[PDB]
Symmetry: C3
């Protein structure tokens, strides 16, 4: 079970890796949106998807916390 | 096994979270590509990676469906 | 255990899917950063997050290799 627990712990760890990666890429995307904005329908779609992504990120964080608590029990 | 099944179900759920997050960020990236385009080698690389990412997204969706069916059995 | 091993193998496979997806999206982001740059505080934040993301990607790759080796044992 110890080796069983270790793989699962590596998988849950990798999900946190991936989520942090996604979060960092969101910061970058918002930076480019800002650059493009410094230089309509586009504004509407930017907002709708930006809203969606932050919502998806929070839910991922919540699920990450649950998975790690479940793994620990 | 019930608590075993629950962690795995949270992990598979988290992968769907992550995939949807990635998909949303793709919509955003395509929006910025569109803004930059409104304002060569760049066009070629945009197309090659855009093609790759949509292919990776579809394969991820296929694998997501399998994982969830396998979890249910 | 065979069906057990298969789900876990699909999950680890899906993490590689997701990581490759994230990597491809990084190539795209860097392309748009390049387009915006062709057309200060912005430069500093771009660099700090670009650095973070490549670091997160390498660590994800390392963890991916471990997870797959652990799965195989």
């Amino acid at each position: 079970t110890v080796q069983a627990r270790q793989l699962l712990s590596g998988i849950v760890q990798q999900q946190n890796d991936l989520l942090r990666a996604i979060e960092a890429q969101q910061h970058l995307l918002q930076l480019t949106v800002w650059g493009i904005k410094q230089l309509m329908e586009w504004d509407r779609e930017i907002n709708n998807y930006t809203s969606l992504i932050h919502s998806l990120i929070e839910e991922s964080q919540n699920q990450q916390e649950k998975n790690e608590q479940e793994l620990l029990e």
